[PDB]
């Protein structure tokens, strides 16, 4: 949890500055759309009482964190597979290769994928992601938890995503850019440099979500 | 396949 420490310090710092508790607030001056995430979670399915958590990333790949802490990942070609065991052992194969050891888990991934496809809305479909690297690994879901107000999704690339149940607003925090992308209730998205929010301030609603984000990151570090 | 919880349907 090296990236989480950076994110905590970053969030602690912005909240301490009290960005909404100022007379002059100019959050537009803190916008940096050069910092849009490469990846975020566009769909999720919590079936952890039986199977685990399934999700979609913005690139159309899918994953499932099974209850046994194994992970299956379908790349956006809908065929290429990455299997990650508890100890970290990874395997690269295909749905069509038909490996008998994994058919139970592959079948489940298809159910998750189908449920998301025909039932659920794709978050940030109106956002173009940042390019990235052709060599870099596909991120996966490291860990997650739900509160009564939000789901918290921590990816292996260090990004933390928080979705709020009440009003559909979402936060995407990247510690590498020290940046936050905010999707409001009207589905508008803005990316802010956190250090610039300390100087220019932001509206009341973003500030309170940055306050909540910090609590959640505390929970993440504190679960180790 | 009826999951109890999920993102915005």
């Amino acid at each position: 949890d090296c990236h989480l420490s950076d994110m905590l310090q970053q969030l602690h710092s912005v909240n301490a500055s009290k960005p909404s508790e100022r007379g002059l607030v100019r959050q537009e001056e803190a916008e940096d759309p050069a910092c849009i995430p490469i990846f975020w979670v566009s769909k999720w399915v919590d079936y952890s009482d039986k199977y685990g958590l399934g999700y979609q990333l913005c690139d159309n790949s899918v994953g499932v964190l099974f209850n046994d802490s194994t992970r299956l990942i379908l790349y956006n070609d809908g065929d290429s597979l990455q299997y990650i065991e508890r100890d970290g052992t990874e395997s690269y194969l295909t749905v069509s290769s038909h490996p008998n050891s994994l058919m139970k888990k592959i079948t489940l991934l298809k159910y998750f994928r189908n449920y998301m496809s025909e039932h659920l809305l794709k978050a940030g479909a109106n956002i173009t992601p940042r390019e990235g690297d052709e060599l870099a690994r596909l991120p996966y879901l490291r860990t997650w938890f739900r509160t009564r107000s939000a789901i918290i999704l921590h990816l292996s690339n260090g990004s933390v995503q928080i979705n709020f149940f009440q009003d559909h607003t979402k936060l995407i925090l990247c510690p590498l850019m020290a940046a936050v992308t905010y999707i409001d209730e009207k589905r508008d998205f803005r990316t802010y440099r956190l250090s610039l929010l300390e100087e220019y301030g932001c509206c009341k609603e973003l500030a309170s979500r940055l306050r909540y984000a910090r609590t959640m990151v505390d929970k993440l570090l504190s679960s180790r | 396949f009826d999951p109890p919880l999920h993102s915005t349907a």
Side-chain angles (χ1 to χ4, degrees), chain A residues 2-17 19-27 29-49 51-85 87-97 99 101-103 105-130 132-133 136-141 143-147 149-185 188-192 194-203 205-223, chain B:
Chain A
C2 31
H3 289 139
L4 282 174
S5 294
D6 289 332
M7 196 78 264
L8 217 208
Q9 263 136 91
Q10 288 155 6
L11 284 171
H12 167 89
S13 184
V14 72
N15 297 329
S17 75
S20 70
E21 204 171 310
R22 284 172 221 166
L24 184 57
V25 166
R26 300 173 286 174
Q27 77 191 83
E29 211 77 63
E31 289 187 40
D32 198 357
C35 295
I36 347 251
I38 323 277
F39 291 102
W40 59 91
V41 182
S42 23
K43 303 183 189 189
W44 59 265
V45 175
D46 182 1
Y47 214 159
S48 56
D49 54 317
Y51 309 109
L53 193 131
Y55 57 97
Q56 190 204 48
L57 300 176
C58 60
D59 78 319
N60 293 285
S61 64
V62 296
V64 26
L65 176 53
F66 296 91
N67 280 355
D68 67 3
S69 295
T70 65
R71 295 174 181 92
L72 202 55
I73 293 151
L74 185 72
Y75 292 78
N76 65 28
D77 69 15
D79 175 60
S80 301
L81 276 172
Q82 193 197 358
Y83 185 58
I84 304 161
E85 310 199 68
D87 64 17
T89 297
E90 71 185 3
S91 290
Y92 299 90
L93 47 301
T94 55
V95 171
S96 60
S97 76
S101 54
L102 278 183
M103 249 51 201
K105 282 178 187 178
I106 290 167
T107 307
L108 291 176
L109 189 148
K110 270 140 68 187
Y111 298 148
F112 279 104
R113 147 153 182 152
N114 286 349
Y115 183 91
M116 297 189 272
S117 181
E118 66 198 80
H119 296 295
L120 313 184
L121 273 72
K122 210 212 180 215
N126 63 331
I127 319 178
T128 307
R130 213 190 330 123
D133 207 332
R137 272 161 196 262
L138 221 219
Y140 57 89
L141 188 63
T143 192
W144 70 281
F145 63 85
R146 274 164 37 253
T147 63
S149 300
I151 190 163
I152 289 79
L153 304 149
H154 173 40
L155 302 174
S156 61
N157 71 6
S159 283
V160 173
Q161 175 165 343
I162 303 166
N163 290 16
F164 296 88
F165 302 143
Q166 186 89 321
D167 58 3
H168 294 329
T169 69
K170 302 170 179 66
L171 281 189
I172 310 154
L173 293 139
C174 174
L176 302 166
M177 302 270 151
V180 67
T181 289
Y182 179 45
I183 304 157
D184 61 19
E185 61 290 334
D188 247 319
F189 61 95
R190 323 230 90 123
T191 308
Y192 302 93
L194 291 170
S195 62
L196 296 179
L197 289 184
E198 299 180 46
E199 200 214 356
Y200 292 113
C202 63
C203 60
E205 37 278 285
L206 181 46
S208 96
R209 281 154 179 85
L210 293 165
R211 273 181 252 121
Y212 194 86
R214 187 260 169 84
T215 318
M216 297 304 101
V217 182
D218 269 305
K219 264 199 151 186
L220 284 171
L221 280 158
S222 156
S223 70
Chain B
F1 205 74
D2 211 345
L5 307 143
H6 49 80
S7 54
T8 297

